[PDB]
Protein backbone atom coordinates (compact mmCIF):
# COMPACT_ATOMS: atom_id res chain seq x y z
CA UNK A 1 0.00 0.00 0.00
CA UNK A 2 2.57 2.57 -1.20
CA UNK A 3 2.34 6.38 -0.95
CA UNK A 4 -0.59 8.59 -2.04
CA UNK A 5 -0.13 10.71 -5.17
CA UNK A 6 0.31 14.43 -4.44
CA UNK A 7 -1.73 17.00 -6.43
CA UNK A 8 -1.16 20.75 -6.58
CA UNK A 9 -3.99 22.83 -7.78
CA UNK A 10 -3.12 26.30 -8.84
CA UNK A 11 -5.06 29.15 -10.28
CA UNK A 12 -5.94 32.83 -9.94
CA UNK A 13 -8.94 33.62 -7.71
CA UNK A 14 -10.88 34.82 -10.78
CA UNK A 15 -10.65 31.36 -12.38
CA UNK A 16 -12.73 30.07 -9.46
CA UNK A 17 -9.86 27.91 -8.24
CA UNK A 18 -10.73 28.22 -4.53
CA UNK A 19 -14.42 27.57 -5.12
CA UNK A 20 -13.36 24.50 -7.09
CA UNK A 21 -11.28 23.12 -4.22
CA UNK A 22 -14.17 23.66 -1.81
CA UNK A 23 -16.46 21.80 -4.16
CA UNK A 24 -13.84 19.09 -4.49
CA UNK A 25 -13.77 18.63 -0.66
CA UNK A 26 -17.60 18.51 -0.34
CA UNK A 27 -18.35 17.33 3.20
CA UNK A 28 -21.99 16.55 4.08
CA UNK A 29 -18.73 9.20 8.89
CA UNK A 30 -14.94 9.39 9.34
CA UNK A 31 -14.85 12.66 7.38
CA UNK A 32 -12.59 14.35 4.79
CA UNK A 33 -9.21 15.15 6.22
CA UNK A 34 -8.35 18.84 6.42
CA UNK A 35 -4.65 18.26 7.19
CA UNK A 36 -2.26 21.09 7.90
CA UNK A 37 -1.41 22.78 4.62
CA UNK A 38 -3.24 20.14 2.57
CA UNK A 39 -6.43 18.20 2.07
CA UNK A 40 -6.36 14.42 2.19
CA UNK A 41 -8.68 12.22 0.12
CA UNK A 42 -8.97 8.61 1.29
CA UNK A 43 -9.39 6.18 -1.67
CA UNK A 44 -12.83 5.30 -0.27
CA UNK A 45 -13.99 8.90 -0.65
CA UNK A 46 -12.46 9.04 -4.17
CA UNK A 47 -14.40 5.89 -5.21
CA UNK A 48 -17.54 7.46 -3.75
CA UNK A 49 -16.91 10.75 -5.57
CA UNK A 50 -16.10 8.99 -8.87
CA UNK A 51 -18.85 6.36 -8.85
CA UNK A 52 -20.58 8.24 -11.63
CA UNK A 53 -17.45 7.78 -13.80
CA UNK A 54 -18.30 4.06 -14.13
CA UNK A 55 -20.59 5.10 -17.02
CA UNK A 56 -17.56 5.95 -19.19
CA UNK A 57 -14.29 4.49 -17.93
CA UNK A 58 -12.47 1.57 -16.36
CA UNK A 59 -11.96 2.30 -12.66
CA UNK A 60 -8.69 1.39 -10.90
CA UNK A 61 -7.88 1.86 -7.22
CA UNK A 62 -4.25 0.85 -6.61
CA UNK A 63 -3.53 3.77 -4.18
CA UNK A 64 -4.50 4.52 -0.52
CA UNK A 65 -5.90 7.91 -1.50
CA UNK A 66 -4.91 11.39 -2.58
CA UNK A 67 -3.13 14.45 -1.30
CA UNK A 68 -4.14 17.87 -2.62
CA UNK A 69 -2.33 21.15 -1.98
CA UNK A 70 -4.56 24.17 -2.62
CA UNK A 71 -2.19 27.11 -2.54
CA UNK A 72 -0.63 28.94 -5.53
CA UNK A 73 2.03 30.24 -3.14
CA UNK A 74 2.65 26.71 -1.89
CA UNK A 75 2.53 25.70 -5.58
CA UNK A 76 5.36 28.22 -5.88
CA UNK A 77 6.65 26.57 -2.66
CA UNK A 78 5.94 23.06 -4.01
CA UNK A 79 8.00 24.51 -6.89
CA UNK A 80 10.33 25.67 -4.10
CA UNK A 81 11.86 22.20 -3.80
CA UNK A 82 11.70 22.56 -7.62
CA UNK A 83 14.11 20.69 -9.90
CA UNK A 84 16.06 18.95 -7.08
CA UNK A 85 12.83 17.68 -5.52
CA UNK A 86 9.48 17.47 -7.29
CA UNK A 87 6.84 18.16 -4.69
CA UNK A 88 3.66 17.29 -6.59
CA UNK A 89 3.25 14.20 -8.64
CA UNK A 90 0.88 16.31 -10.81
CA UNK A 91 -0.67 19.82 -11.19
CA UNK A 92 -4.24 20.89 -11.88
CA UNK A 93 -4.18 24.15 -13.82
CA UNK A 94 -7.46 26.07 -13.54
CA UNK A 95 -8.75 28.19 -16.46
CA UNK A 96 -11.97 30.26 -16.79
CA UNK A 97 -14.00 28.98 -19.77
CA UNK A 98 -15.64 32.35 -20.30
CA UNK A 99 -12.27 34.17 -20.37
CA UNK A 100 -9.69 31.88 -21.92
CA UNK A 101 -5.98 32.20 -21.16
CA UNK A 102 -5.21 35.14 -18.88
CA UNK A 103 -1.83 36.66 -18.10
CA UNK A 104 -1.22 34.56 -14.98
CA UNK A 105 -2.32 31.36 -16.73
CA UNK A 106 0.36 32.03 -19.37
CA UNK A 107 2.95 32.30 -16.63
CA UNK A 108 1.79 29.19 -14.75
CA UNK A 109 2.12 27.27 -18.04
CA UNK A 110 5.69 28.48 -18.55
CA UNK A 111 6.41 27.70 -14.90
CA UNK A 112 5.13 24.10 -15.19
CA UNK A 113 6.88 23.64 -18.57
CA UNK A 114 10.07 24.62 -16.73
CA UNK A 115 10.06 22.00 -13.98
CA UNK A 116 8.90 19.46 -16.59
CA UNK A 117 6.02 18.91 -14.13
CA UNK A 118 3.01 17.00 -15.56
CA UNK A 119 -0.38 18.65 -15.43
CA UNK A 120 -4.01 18.47 -16.35
CA UNK A 121 -6.24 21.49 -17.06
CA UNK A 122 -9.52 22.13 -15.28
CA UNK A 123 -11.63 24.12 -17.72
CA UNK A 124 -13.80 25.67 -15.02
CA UNK A 125 -17.01 27.77 -14.97
CA UNK A 126 -19.04 25.73 -17.43
CA UNK A 127 -22.13 26.59 -15.40
CA UNK A 128 -21.95 29.97 -17.13
CA UNK A 129 -22.69 28.48 -20.53
CA UNK A 130 -25.64 30.54 -21.64
CA UNK A 131 -28.25 27.81 -21.69
CA UNK A 132 -26.50 25.25 -19.43
CA UNK A 133 -28.77 22.92 -17.54
CA UNK A 134 -27.04 21.67 -14.38
CA UNK A 135 -26.92 18.08 -13.01
CA UNK A 136 -25.02 18.57 -9.73
CA UNK A 137 -21.94 16.43 -9.20
CA UNK A 138 -22.53 14.58 -12.52
CA UNK A 139 -19.72 13.44 -14.82
CA UNK A 140 -19.08 15.97 -17.60
CA UNK A 141 -19.85 13.66 -20.50
CA UNK A 142 -23.20 12.77 -19.00
CA UNK A 143 -24.27 16.40 -18.38
CA UNK A 144 -22.99 17.34 -21.85
CA UNK A 145 -24.96 14.69 -23.70
CA UNK A 146 -28.05 16.04 -21.88
CA UNK A 147 -27.41 19.64 -23.04
CA UNK A 148 -28.98 21.50 -26.00
CA UNK A 149 -27.16 21.88 -29.32
CA UNK A 150 -27.07 25.61 -28.47
CA UNK A 151 -24.90 24.78 -25.45
CA UNK A 152 -23.02 22.05 -27.37
CA UNK A 153 -22.13 24.75 -29.94
CA UNK A 154 -21.10 27.34 -27.38
CA UNK A 155 -18.92 24.84 -25.61
CA UNK A 156 -17.21 23.69 -28.81
CA UNK A 157 -16.45 27.30 -29.76
CA UNK A 158 -15.00 28.49 -26.45
CA UNK A 159 -13.22 25.15 -26.03
CA UNK A 160 -11.60 25.01 -29.40
CA UNK A 161 -10.56 28.64 -29.03
CA UNK A 162 -8.91 27.97 -25.63
CA UNK A 163 -7.32 24.90 -27.20
CA UNK A 164 -5.96 27.33 -29.80
CA UNK A 165 -4.78 29.91 -27.28
CA UNK A 166 -2.93 27.01 -25.57
CA UNK A 167 -1.34 26.00 -28.89
CA UNK A 168 -0.06 29.57 -29.11
CA UNK A 169 1.76 29.02 -25.80
CA UNK A 170 3.37 25.83 -27.06
CA UNK A 171 0.79 23.37 -25.75
CA UNK A 172 -1.03 20.70 -27.63
CA UNK A 173 -4.14 19.95 -25.64
CA UNK A 174 -7.34 17.93 -25.88
CA UNK A 175 -10.39 17.00 -23.90
CA UNK A 176 -9.03 14.24 -21.69
CA UNK A 177 -11.14 11.44 -23.12
CA UNK A 178 -10.17 12.49 -26.65
CA UNK A 179 -6.36 12.46 -26.39
CA UNK A 180 -4.31 9.93 -28.37
CA UNK A 181 -1.11 10.71 -26.45
CA UNK A 182 -1.19 11.96 -22.85
CA UNK A 183 2.50 12.79 -23.32
CA UNK A 184 3.29 15.84 -25.50
CA UNK A 185 -0.42 16.65 -24.95
CA UNK A 186 -2.40 18.20 -22.08
CA UNK A 187 -5.64 16.74 -20.74
CA UNK A 188 -8.65 19.11 -20.45
CA UNK A 189 -11.41 18.40 -17.97
CA UNK A 190 -14.42 20.70 -17.94
CA UNK A 191 -15.62 21.56 -14.46
CA UNK A 192 -18.02 23.63 -12.50
CA UNK A 193 -17.04 24.75 -9.03
CA UNK A 194 -20.67 25.80 -8.63
CA UNK A 195 -22.55 22.59 -9.54
CA UNK A 196 -19.68 20.12 -9.04
CA UNK A 197 -20.14 18.87 -12.60
CA UNK A 198 -16.96 17.35 -14.00
CA UNK A 199 -15.25 16.97 -10.62
CA UNK A 200 -15.80 13.19 -10.91
CA UNK A 201 -13.99 13.35 -14.26
CA UNK A 202 -11.08 15.25 -12.79
CA UNK A 203 -10.73 12.87 -9.84
CA UNK A 204 -10.71 9.90 -12.18
CA UNK A 205 -8.08 11.44 -14.45
CA UNK A 206 -5.60 12.11 -11.61
CA UNK A 207 -5.62 8.45 -10.57
CA UNK A 208 -5.15 7.41 -14.22
CA UNK A 209 -2.19 9.79 -14.73
CA UNK A 210 -0.50 8.75 -11.49
CA UNK A 211 -1.16 5.08 -10.66
CA UNK A 212 0.76 3.48 -13.54
CA UNK A 213 2.80 6.14 -15.37
CA UNK A 214 3.81 7.45 -11.94
CA UNK A 215 8.91 3.61 1.45
CA UNK A 216 11.69 3.25 4.06
CA UNK A 217 13.53 6.51 3.26
CA UNK A 218 12.03 9.65 4.75
CA UNK A 219 11.06 12.35 2.27
CA UNK A 220 9.95 15.55 3.96
CA UNK A 221 9.54 19.08 2.61
CA UNK A 222 9.25 22.35 4.52
CA UNK A 223 6.26 24.20 3.26
CA UNK A 224 6.07 26.98 5.83
CA UNK A 225 7.84 28.40 8.89
CA UNK A 226 5.36 29.69 11.45
CA UNK A 227 5.43 31.01 15.04
CA UNK A 228 2.78 29.21 17.10
CA UNK A 229 1.51 30.67 20.40
CA UNK A 230 2.46 27.67 22.56
CA UNK A 231 5.29 26.13 20.54
CA UNK A 232 7.58 28.98 19.41
CA UNK A 233 8.76 28.58 15.82
CA UNK A 234 7.31 25.57 13.97
CA UNK A 235 7.70 24.11 10.47
CA UNK A 236 4.74 22.93 8.43
CA UNK A 237 5.87 20.03 6.24
CA UNK A 238 4.56 17.58 3.67
CA UNK A 239 5.77 14.04 4.27
CA UNK A 240 6.05 11.97 1.08
CA UNK A 241 7.81 8.88 2.46
CA UNK A 242 8.33 7.13 5.81
CA UNK A 243 7.42 8.02 9.40
CA UNK A 244 8.03 10.89 11.76
CA UNK A 245 8.21 9.99 15.41
CA UNK A 246 8.36 12.37 18.39
CA UNK A 247 11.96 12.76 19.55
CA UNK A 248 13.22 12.03 16.03
CA UNK A 249 16.46 13.91 15.40
CA UNK A 250 15.96 15.84 12.18
CA UNK A 251 18.16 17.97 9.92
CA UNK A 252 17.06 20.90 7.71
CA UNK A 253 18.38 23.88 5.76
CA UNK A 254 18.66 27.10 7.80
CA UNK A 255 19.62 30.62 6.69
CA UNK A 256 22.65 30.51 8.97
CA UNK A 257 23.78 26.96 8.20
CA UNK A 258 22.41 23.43 8.73
CA UNK A 259 20.02 23.07 11.66
CA UNK A 260 19.78 19.91 13.72
CA UNK A 261 16.97 19.39 16.23
CA UNK A 262 14.62 16.90 17.82
CA UNK A 263 10.87 16.65 17.19
CA UNK A 264 9.16 18.00 20.33
CA UNK A 265 5.70 17.61 18.74
CA UNK A 266 3.95 16.23 15.69
CA UNK A 267 0.77 18.27 15.38
CA UNK A 268 -2.31 18.10 13.15
CA UNK A 269 -5.52 20.12 13.53
CA UNK A 270 -8.39 18.98 15.76
CA UNK A 271 -11.30 16.85 14.33
CA UNK A 272 -13.86 18.22 16.78
CA UNK A 273 -14.91 21.77 16.01
CA UNK A 274 -16.09 21.97 19.63
CA UNK A 275 -12.94 20.36 21.05
CA UNK A 276 -10.59 22.91 19.58
CA UNK A 277 -10.37 25.65 22.15
CA UNK A 278 -9.22 23.51 25.04
CA UNK A 279 -7.80 20.89 22.68
CA UNK A 280 -6.09 23.16 20.14
CA UNK A 281 -4.35 20.68 17.80
CA UNK A 282 -3.70 16.96 18.21
CA UNK A 283 -0.28 15.56 19.19
CA UNK A 284 1.04 12.39 17.62
CA UNK A 285 3.70 9.97 18.77
CA UNK A 286 4.16 9.02 15.13
CA UNK A 287 2.79 9.77 11.63
CA UNK A 288 3.09 7.98 8.25
CA UNK A 289 3.71 9.31 4.78
CA UNK A 290 1.14 11.10 2.65
CA UNK A 291 0.06 13.76 5.12
CA UNK A 292 0.71 17.39 5.95
CA UNK A 293 2.01 17.90 9.47
CA UNK A 294 3.27 20.63 11.81
CA UNK A 295 6.56 19.97 13.68
CA UNK A 296 7.31 21.81 16.95
CA UNK A 297 10.96 21.86 18.01
CA UNK A 298 13.76 24.07 19.25
CA UNK A 299 16.11 25.85 16.84
CA UNK A 300 13.60 26.32 14.05
CA UNK A 301 13.77 30.15 14.10
CA UNK A 302 15.92 30.40 10.97
CA UNK A 303 14.50 27.36 9.18
CA UNK A 304 14.24 27.86 5.41
CA UNK A 305 10.91 27.27 3.76
CA UNK A 306 11.40 24.97 0.73
CA UNK A 307 14.02 22.90 2.53
CA UNK A 308 14.09 19.12 2.45
CA UNK A 309 13.86 17.44 5.85
CA UNK A 310 15.95 14.45 6.95
CA UNK A 311 15.73 12.06 9.90
CA UNK A 312 19.14 11.08 11.29
CA UNK A 313 19.34 7.29 11.74
CA UNK A 314 21.51 4.99 13.91
CA UNK A 315 24.10 4.27 11.19
CA UNK A 316 23.80 7.70 9.52
CA UNK A 317 26.49 10.27 10.30
CA UNK A 318 24.89 13.56 11.34
CA UNK A 319 27.58 15.74 9.75
CA UNK A 320 27.04 14.27 6.26
CA UNK A 321 23.28 14.76 6.41
CA UNK A 322 23.95 18.33 7.58
CA UNK A 323 25.72 18.44 4.22
CA UNK A 324 22.76 16.97 2.29
CA UNK A 325 19.78 19.23 3.10
CA UNK A 326 21.86 22.34 2.45
CA UNK A 327 22.83 21.03 -1.03
CA UNK A 328 19.83 22.61 -2.79
CA UNK A 329 20.77 26.09 -1.60
CA UNK A 330 24.52 25.40 -1.76
CA UNK A 331 24.16 24.84 -5.49
CA UNK A 332 22.35 28.18 -5.59
CA UNK A 333 24.87 29.94 -3.33
CA UNK A 334 27.90 28.90 -5.42
CA UNK A 335 26.50 30.47 -8.66
CA UNK A 336 26.74 34.01 -7.23
CA UNK A 337 29.59 36.48 -7.91
CA UNK A 338 30.73 36.64 -4.29
CA UNK A 339 33.58 39.18 -4.48
CA UNK A 340 32.28 40.79 -7.68
CA UNK A 341 30.05 43.79 -8.31
CA UNK A 342 26.38 42.76 -8.35
CA UNK A 343 22.86 43.36 -7.07
CA UNK A 344 21.83 41.62 -3.88
CA UNK A 345 18.88 39.22 -4.05
CA UNK A 346 16.44 38.00 -1.36
CA UNK A 347 13.49 35.59 -1.45
CA UNK A 348 10.77 33.83 0.57
CA UNK A 349 11.40 30.19 -0.50
CA UNK A 350 14.17 28.10 -2.02
CA UNK A 351 12.17 27.95 -5.23
CA UNK A 352 11.28 31.64 -5.36
CA UNK A 353 14.99 32.18 -5.10
CA UNK A 354 16.01 29.64 -7.77
CA UNK A 355 13.37 31.09 -10.13
CA UNK A 356 14.52 34.69 -9.60
CA UNK A 357 18.20 33.75 -9.97
CA UNK A 358 17.54 31.77 -13.13
CA UNK A 359 15.57 34.71 -14.55
CA UNK A 360 18.37 37.17 -13.76
CA UNK A 361 21.01 34.84 -15.28
CA UNK A 362 19.12 35.19 -18.59
CA UNK A 363 18.85 38.95 -18.42
CA UNK A 364 22.52 38.83 -17.44
CA UNK A 365 22.14 40.91 -14.27
CA UNK A 366 25.11 40.01 -12.07
CA UNK A 367 24.44 38.82 -8.53
CA UNK A 368 26.76 39.71 -5.61
CA UNK A 369 24.83 37.74 -2.95
CA UNK A 370 21.59 35.92 -2.20
CA UNK A 371 19.56 35.60 0.99
CA UNK A 372 16.33 34.31 2.49
CA UNK A 373 13.50 35.62 4.62
CA UNK A 374 12.97 38.95 6.40
CA UNK A 375 15.29 41.70 5.20
CA UNK A 376 17.48 43.31 7.90
CA UNK A 377 20.24 45.92 8.15
CA UNK A 378 22.67 43.00 7.97
CA UNK A 379 21.35 41.95 4.54
CA UNK A 380 21.01 45.48 3.14
CA UNK A 381 24.63 46.09 4.28
CA UNK A 382 25.68 43.58 1.61
CA UNK A 383 24.42 46.02 -1.04
CA UNK A 384 26.11 49.00 0.68
CA UNK A 385 29.50 47.88 -0.72
CA UNK A 386 28.29 48.73 -4.23
CA UNK A 387 27.56 52.47 -3.80
CA UNK A 388 31.04 53.56 -5.07
CA UNK A 389 31.94 50.64 -7.38
CA UNK A 390 28.60 50.14 -9.19
CA UNK A 391 25.80 52.46 -7.89
CA UNK A 392 23.24 51.04 -10.32
CA UNK A 393 23.66 47.77 -8.49
CA UNK A 394 23.14 49.48 -5.06
CA UNK A 395 19.85 47.67 -4.89
CA UNK A 396 18.15 44.65 -3.39
CA UNK A 397 15.94 42.49 -5.56
CA UNK A 398 13.45 41.06 -3.05
CA UNK A 399 10.63 38.65 -3.71
CA UNK A 400 7.75 38.11 -1.30
CA UNK A 401 9.66 39.18 1.80
CA UNK A 402 8.87 41.47 4.68
CA UNK A 403 11.47 44.19 5.26
CA UNK A 404 12.40 45.52 8.73
CA UNK A 405 11.37 49.05 9.71
CA UNK A 406 14.95 49.49 10.97
CA UNK A 407 16.38 48.14 7.69
CA UNK A 408 14.05 50.20 5.44
CA UNK A 409 14.73 53.30 7.56
CA UNK A 410 18.45 52.47 7.26
CA UNK A 411 18.26 51.95 3.46
CA UNK A 412 16.92 55.55 3.44
CA UNK A 413 20.15 56.97 4.92
CA UNK A 414 22.20 55.51 2.06
CA UNK A 415 20.84 55.28 -1.51
CA UNK A 416 19.73 51.64 -1.46
CA UNK A 417 16.85 50.83 -3.78
CA UNK A 418 14.82 47.98 -2.28
CA UNK A 419 12.72 46.17 -4.91
CA UNK A 420 9.88 44.09 -3.48
CA UNK A 421 7.03 42.29 -5.32
CA UNK A 422 5.43 38.87 -5.90
CA UNK A 423 6.45 38.54 -9.55
CA UNK A 424 9.59 39.49 -11.46
CA UNK A 425 7.89 42.17 -13.54
CA UNK A 426 7.66 44.71 -10.75
CA UNK A 427 11.33 44.30 -9.95
CA UNK A 428 12.20 44.07 -13.60
CA UNK A 429 10.32 47.28 -14.41
CA UNK A 430 11.36 49.09 -11.30
CA UNK A 431 14.90 47.81 -11.56
CA UNK A 432 15.19 48.33 -15.27
CA UNK A 433 13.42 51.71 -15.00
CA UNK A 434 15.66 52.78 -12.14
CA UNK A 435 18.72 51.78 -14.16
CA UNK A 436 17.60 53.93 -17.09
CA UNK A 437 16.70 56.83 -14.76
CA UNK A 438 20.20 56.52 -13.32
CA UNK A 439 21.65 56.76 -16.83
CA UNK A 440 19.30 59.73 -17.51
CA UNK A 441 21.01 61.63 -14.67
CA UNK A 442 24.39 60.17 -15.55
CA UNK A 443 24.23 61.18 -19.21
CA UNK A 444 23.57 64.87 -18.51
CA UNK A 445 26.52 65.08 -16.11
CA UNK A 446 28.69 62.82 -18.31
CA UNK A 447 28.35 64.80 -21.57
CA UNK A 448 29.85 67.99 -20.12
CA UNK A 449 32.45 66.04 -18.20
CA UNK A 450 33.18 63.63 -21.09
CA UNK A 451 35.83 64.28 -23.74
CA UNK A 452 37.18 62.26 -26.65
CA UNK A 453 40.88 62.43 -27.55
CA UNK A 454 42.24 64.34 -30.52
CA UNK A 455 45.56 65.77 -31.61
CA UNK A 456 45.59 68.67 -34.10
CA UNK A 457 48.24 70.35 -36.17
CA UNK A 458 47.66 74.04 -36.79
CA UNK A 459 47.92 74.76 -40.45
CA UNK A 460 47.33 78.48 -40.01
CA UNK A 461 45.64 80.97 -37.82
CA UNK A 462 42.51 82.35 -39.38
CA UNK A 463 41.27 84.65 -36.61
CA UNK A 464 43.42 85.27 -33.55
CA UNK A 465 40.62 86.44 -31.27
CA UNK A 466 36.97 87.45 -31.19
CA UNK A 467 36.61 84.59 -31.87
CA UNK A 468 39.76 82.60 -32.25
CA UNK A 469 39.41 80.50 -35.40
CA UNK A 470 42.10 77.95 -36.19
CA UNK A 471 42.72 76.09 -39.44
CA UNK A 472 43.94 72.63 -38.50
CA UNK A 473 44.94 69.10 -39.58
CA UNK A 474 43.60 66.32 -37.28
CA UNK A 475 46.64 64.15 -36.66
CA UNK A 476 44.93 61.59 -34.33
CA UNK A 477 41.45 60.82 -32.92
CA UNK A 478 38.06 62.55 -33.15
CA UNK A 479 37.82 66.35 -33.10
CA UNK A 480 34.25 67.29 -32.33
CA UNK A 481 31.96 70.17 -31.44
CA UNK A 482 32.03 70.79 -27.68
CA UNK A 483 35.57 69.48 -27.31
CA UNK A 484 37.88 71.78 -25.33
CA UNK A 485 41.16 72.47 -27.15
CA UNK A 486 44.45 73.20 -25.42
CA UNK A 487 48.20 73.71 -25.65
CA UNK A 488 50.74 71.96 -23.43
CA UNK A 489 53.84 74.06 -22.97
CA UNK A 490 56.80 73.55 -20.70
CA UNK A 491 59.12 76.49 -20.10
CA UNK A 492 62.54 75.12 -21.15
CA UNK A 493 63.60 74.96 -17.48
CA UNK A 494 61.45 76.90 -14.94
CA UNK A 495 57.82 75.88 -15.50
CA UNK A 496 58.37 72.19 -16.28
CA UNK A 497 54.71 71.86 -17.37
CA UNK A 498 51.60 73.75 -18.51
CA UNK A 499 48.03 73.75 -19.72
CA UNK A 500 46.76 76.58 -21.94
CA UNK A 501 43.08 76.20 -22.71
CA UNK A 502 42.25 77.99 -26.02
CA UNK A 503 38.46 77.31 -25.98
CA UNK A 504 35.75 74.73 -26.75
CA UNK A 505 34.80 73.93 -30.40
CA UNK A 506 31.65 75.75 -31.51
CA UNK A 507 31.65 74.74 -35.15
CA UNK A 508 33.69 72.83 -37.70
CA UNK A 509 33.87 73.62 -41.40
CA UNK A 510 35.43 71.37 -44.00
CA UNK A 511 35.10 71.99 -47.74
CA UNK A 512 32.54 74.76 -47.25
CA UNK A 513 30.24 72.64 -45.18
CA UNK A 514 29.39 72.50 -41.47
CA UNK A 515 30.29 69.21 -39.92
CA UNK A 516 29.84 68.12 -36.33
CA UNK A 517 32.91 65.92 -36.05
CA UNK A 518 36.15 65.08 -37.90
CA UNK A 519 37.97 61.71 -37.44
CA UNK A 520 41.62 61.33 -38.55
CA UNK A 521 41.53 60.48 -42.28
CA UNK A 522 37.94 61.70 -43.02
CA UNK A 523 39.41 64.54 -45.08
CA UNK A 524 42.69 65.98 -46.38
CA UNK A 525 41.37 69.48 -46.56
CA UNK A 526 41.95 70.97 -43.21
CA UNK A 527 39.19 72.23 -41.08
CA UNK A 528 38.38 75.64 -39.68
CA UNK A 529 37.73 75.36 -36.00
CA UNK A 530 35.75 78.10 -34.35
CA UNK A 531 36.43 78.23 -30.62
CA UNK A 532 34.13 79.65 -27.95
CA UNK A 533 36.10 81.85 -25.55
CA UNK A 534 36.97 80.06 -22.28
CA UNK A 535 36.25 81.87 -19.01
CA UNK A 536 39.33 83.83 -17.95
CA UNK A 537 41.90 85.30 -20.34
CA UNK A 538 42.22 83.34 -23.58
CA UNK A 539 45.90 82.81 -24.39
CA UNK A 540 47.16 85.23 -26.99
CA UNK A 541 48.16 83.90 -30.37
CA UNK A 542 51.82 84.53 -31.18
CA UNK A 543 52.62 85.63 -27.64
CA UNK A 544 51.53 82.43 -25.81
CA UNK A 545 50.46 79.84 -28.40
CA UNK A 546 51.42 79.66 -32.07
CA UNK A 547 51.49 77.62 -35.29
CA UNK A 548 54.14 75.22 -33.98
CA UNK A 549 52.40 74.13 -30.81
CA UNK A 550 50.60 70.78 -31.22
CA UNK A 551 47.20 71.14 -29.64
CA UNK A 552 45.07 68.45 -27.99
CA UNK A 553 41.64 67.87 -26.47
CA UNK A 554 41.94 68.76 -22.83
CA UNK A 555 41.89 65.44 -20.94
CA UNK A 556 42.07 64.92 -17.22
CA UNK A 557 41.55 62.24 -14.62
CA UNK A 558 37.87 63.30 -14.52
CA UNK A 559 37.67 63.38 -18.32
CA UNK A 560 38.97 59.82 -18.51
CA UNK A 561 36.72 58.36 -15.79
CA UNK A 562 33.58 59.81 -17.37
CA UNK A 563 34.45 57.87 -20.54
CA UNK A 564 34.41 54.59 -18.60
CA UNK A 565 30.77 54.73 -17.47
CA UNK A 566 27.64 55.38 -19.55
CA UNK A 567 29.73 56.75 -22.42
CA UNK A 568 31.72 53.52 -22.84
CA UNK A 569 29.18 51.10 -24.28
CA UNK A 570 29.42 51.97 -28.00
CA UNK A 571 30.99 55.43 -28.38
CA UNK A 572 34.72 54.88 -27.80
CA UNK A 573 37.06 53.25 -30.31
CA UNK A 574 40.13 51.19 -29.41
CA UNK A 575 42.18 53.77 -31.36
CA UNK A 576 40.79 56.33 -28.90
CA UNK A 577 41.74 54.41 -25.74
CA UNK A 578 45.21 54.02 -27.26
CA UNK A 579 45.33 57.75 -27.89
CA UNK A 580 44.24 58.39 -24.28
CA UNK A 581 47.22 56.25 -23.23
CA UNK A 582 49.55 58.65 -25.06
CA UNK A 583 47.77 61.81 -23.89
CA UNK A 584 48.26 60.97 -20.22
CA UNK A 585 52.02 60.93 -20.97
CA UNK A 586 51.77 64.45 -22.38
CA UNK A 587 49.48 65.75 -19.63
CA UNK A 588 51.33 63.96 -16.81
CA UNK A 589 48.34 61.91 -15.74
CA UNK A 590 48.85 58.51 -14.06
Amino acid sequence: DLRSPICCILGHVDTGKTKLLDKIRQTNAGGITQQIGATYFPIDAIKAKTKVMAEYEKQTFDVPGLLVIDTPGHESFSNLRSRGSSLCNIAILVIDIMHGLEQQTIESIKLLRDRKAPFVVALNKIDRLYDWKAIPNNSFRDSFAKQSRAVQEEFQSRYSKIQLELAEQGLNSELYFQNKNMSKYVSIVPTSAVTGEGVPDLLWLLLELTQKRMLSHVEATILEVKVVEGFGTTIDVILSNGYLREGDRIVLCGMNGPIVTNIRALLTPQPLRELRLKSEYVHHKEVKAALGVKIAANDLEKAVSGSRLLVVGPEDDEDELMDDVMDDLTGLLDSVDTTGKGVVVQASTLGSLEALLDFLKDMKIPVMSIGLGPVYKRDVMKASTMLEKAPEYAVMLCFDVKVDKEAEQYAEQEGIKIFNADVIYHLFDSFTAYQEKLLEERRKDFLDYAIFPCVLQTLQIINKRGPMIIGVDVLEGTLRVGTPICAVKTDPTTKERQTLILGKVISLEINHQPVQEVKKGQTAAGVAVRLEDPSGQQPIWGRHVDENDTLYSLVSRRSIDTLKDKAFRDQVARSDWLLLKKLKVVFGIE
Binding site: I560, K564, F568, R574, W577, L578, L580, K584
Partner: peptide
Amino acid sequence: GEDEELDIDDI
Protein backbone atom coordinates in the same frame (compact mmCIF):
# COMPACT_ATOMS: atom_id res chain seq x y z
CA GLY B 1 50.69 49.54 -35.58
CA GLU B 2 51.04 46.73 -33.09
CA ASP B 3 47.28 47.15 -32.45
CA GLU B 4 46.73 44.93 -29.40
CA GLU B 5 46.66 44.95 -26.54
CA LEU B 6 45.50 46.99 -23.54
CA ASP B 7 43.06 47.04 -20.63
CA ILE B 8 40.68 49.66 -19.25
CA ASP B 9 41.10 48.99 -15.52
CA ASP B 10 44.72 50.15 -15.38
CA ILE B 11 43.59 53.68 -16.21
